[PDB]
Amino acid sequence: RQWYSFLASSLVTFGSGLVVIIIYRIVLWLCGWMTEAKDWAGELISGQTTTGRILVGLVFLLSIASLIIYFIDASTNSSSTTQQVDLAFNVFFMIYFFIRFVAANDKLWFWVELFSFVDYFTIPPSFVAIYLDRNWLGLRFLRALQLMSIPDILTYLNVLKTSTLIRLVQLVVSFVSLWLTAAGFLHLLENSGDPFFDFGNAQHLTYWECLYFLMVTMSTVGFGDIFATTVLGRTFVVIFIMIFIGLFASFIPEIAEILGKRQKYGGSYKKERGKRHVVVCGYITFDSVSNFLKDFLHKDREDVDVEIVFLHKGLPGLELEGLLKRHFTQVEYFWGSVMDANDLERVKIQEADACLVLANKYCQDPDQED
Amino acid sequence: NVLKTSTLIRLVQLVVSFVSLWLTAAGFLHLLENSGDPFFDFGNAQHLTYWECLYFLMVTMSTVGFGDIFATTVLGRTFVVIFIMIFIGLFASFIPEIAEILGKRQKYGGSYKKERGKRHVVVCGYITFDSVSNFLKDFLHKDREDVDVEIVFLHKGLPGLELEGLLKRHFTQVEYFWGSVMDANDLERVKIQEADACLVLANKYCQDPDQEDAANIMRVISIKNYHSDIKVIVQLLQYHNKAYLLNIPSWDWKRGDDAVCVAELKLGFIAQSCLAPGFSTLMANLFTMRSYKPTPEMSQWQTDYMRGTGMEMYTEYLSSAFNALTFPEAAELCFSKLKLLLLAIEVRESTLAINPGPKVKIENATQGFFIAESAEEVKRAFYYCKNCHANVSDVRQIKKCKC
Ligand SMILES: [Ca+2]
Ligand SMILES: [K+]
Ligand SMILES: [K+]
Ligand SMILES: [K+]
Ligand SMILES: [K+]
Ligand SMILES: [K+]
Ligand SMILES: [Mg+2]
Ligand SMILES: [Mg+2]
């Protein structure tokens, strides 16, 4: 029954501000403190002031609290605790919306920025909810998109130090925020039912069934234990298929690539209480190591407990990794180079018995090798 | 003539080919399933809508295959088999090529919107996370006096993620644009008609320094062809290439056009250590912004050295209290009272005099050159009171209330 009142509250608040901006632009086309305010608000939202650094943290955390209130409203079922706290958070988001409005260079491109729509589709409906005594579930899920600010927060802080960690956190949080958002959108359409059929054609899916069904479809598994049946939910599933198969099929391999590109022979040589060790470096390969070890560890030598510690800037090939495992009790291998003082400390070379520097006897040029 | 470029041609071909084949195949399945099969006297049939067929073809060509809808006539099933063999290839090749074309778009296009009374500096040439971070931490350093200068990077490339993070940390005072100083349209975008200066950074670690110098000389030629009177500061790797830009028709050191020749400077700092051992270190530390900051792990010789590294070169107007002192008296005053080391003065055309003898007086409004920990420390020499208002010499108390 009442849904159009909540929807109208977002459309009139969007449209009226857009009209005011167009009128103001045409008036000043035909016919200082504000720059200090712009740059102050800019330093706030950029996290350059301490008050900014906070405000940004509070906007993030309260957006998560608002999202969790939406999950509770979606897993359940104006005098209620949930409508009260989510209204309080909406008032806080409205203050932050004005701070971005001040900070922005162009008011028109600001009034069409993505988070301005998240605000239009949430603050006005949250006022209407208490006014009409009706906790409408509505577009509130869109707050999940505020998760997508995490790479900016972790960049306004110096914590996200490397290009691969930046790319990793961007991929994961982009995926999760879009998946949570699209699940809320399908949940709205299927539980609404279609307007062309007077909302009679509808399904009572939970949010969690929609979240599962979107994972099952974007992976292209498509069990069909759950499926959309409204014409809006089916046209949404068609649009979702054209977009999110591309996302899943590109994101999951790039996550697997970043998680695969990790040093497996990092860490440090733990010097045993009374044993000697020899560091070995330079040309380290299955051919050099096998010929070295079969002479060094040969049974015709007297029995002496010397550990061999290979140090090399590379991953072992599978043949060498097998050979290292056959000598596990007396041979150890570390990623690194004798050119770094940190790697020399790892191999514990202060208290090695000797260091052996092996040469590539079959290099293209012996002076570069020497 | 509207579809102007090869990628827009390919884009519109892919989209409309896909949509027309998908709409056509949906009509074909709708005919077969609602017809029913002729072998069974049309008794085996389904009353699908066209829209259910259009949906079912999308659900099958994407390989999702819910099976909420499926074909049941032998003709509709053999059509679905033929459709699967053809359209899986189309979907799996078209959707990535659409995503590629939509991805290959300039993200740092657009134009510098010149704020009403702020200055800006254009920066170009070798722009990378390594060059930009080292540049910005000296340019925006807190030991300099507070001035609102915007930095506008112009470069023919997309920022790496490290540089894009650095640009976002300086969002209030640093902006970046895709483009080259070789294009008059890009020079207009960066608004270089009303920039304060243009800085042309060099790749000091290029495979060949003459190709790098030739590129940077062409950039100055381009910048000054667009507007002669912009101050250009350029980094050069070789001294003999400096002759080429001295011969540009519109290059003028009297406007402050300036070629920072890395080889000229490097070897002259080294020559100075041949005359006064270690002076290369004294003088090189003096020309980058650093602030002292002890640590408990630091040995006492390192604390002395590091306290010295915290000082750099500054310029200020000497206060009226210095007028008609000899230079030695002004230097004694600055040191013994103000804790400031006065090296030199710009004598009124004008000429720079370093440690001049008793024969020169300080004029009115003389620029002096100082060594100090920060610009805000040197401002004591400008605020320095009449002797009546600065007898106490607890130097933090020197301030603009001199009268
Ligand atoms: Ca300093
Ligand atoms: K599949
Ligand atoms: K499937
Ligand atoms: K399936
Ligand atoms: K199925
Ligand atoms: K099924
Ligand atoms: Mg061991
Ligand atoms: Mg600006």
Author numbering:
A (entry chain C): 14 to 44, 79 to 124, 134 to 426
B (entry chain D): 214 to 561, 567 to 621
Task: Give verbatim lines from the article.
The large-conductance calcium- and voltage-activated K+ channel (BK) plays a fundamental role in establishing negative feedback loops to control the firing patterns of neurons, transmitter release, insulin secretion, and smooth muscle contraction. BK channels comprise four identical α subunits (Slo1)2,3 with seven transmembrane segments (TMD) and a large C-terminal cytosolic domain (CTD). A voltage sensing domain (VSD, segments S0–S4) and a pore-gate domain (segments S5–S6) reside in the membrane. Additionally, two homologous regulators of the conductance of K+ domains (RCK) in each subunit (RCK1 and RCK2) assemble as a tetrameric gating ring (4× CTD) and serve as the cytoplasmic Ca2+ sensor.
Neutralizing arginine at position R3 (R202Q) drives the VSD towards its resting state, as suggested by the rightward shift of Q-V in the homologous mutant in hBK36. The remaining charged residues in S4 (R1 and R2) maintain similar positions in the R3Q-apo and R3Q Ca2+-bound structures. R1 forms a salt bridge with D120 (S1) with a bond length of 2.7 Å, while R2 couples with D175 (S3) and exhibits weak interactions with F149 (S2). Surprisingly, R3Q channels managed to transition to an open state under Ca2+-bound conditions. This indicates that the conformational changes in the gating ring must affect the structure of the TMD. In the R3Q-apo, the αB helix is partially unfolded at its ends (residues: L374-K381), unlike in the R3Q Ca2+-bound state where the αB helix (residues: L372-R382) is reminiscent of all our open structures. In the Ca2+-bound R3Q structure, a network of interactions between RCK1 and VSD is established. This network connects the αB helix to S5 and S4, with non-covalent interactions involving residues L374-R223, R382-T211, and R382-N214. Additionally, hydrogen bonds connect the αB helix to S4 (K381-D208; 3.2 Å) and the C-linker to S0’ (K331-D86; 3.2 Å). Thus, the open state observed in the R3Q Ca2+-bound condition may be achieved through the interaction between L374 and R223, which underlies the coupling between S5 and S6 observed in all BK open structures.
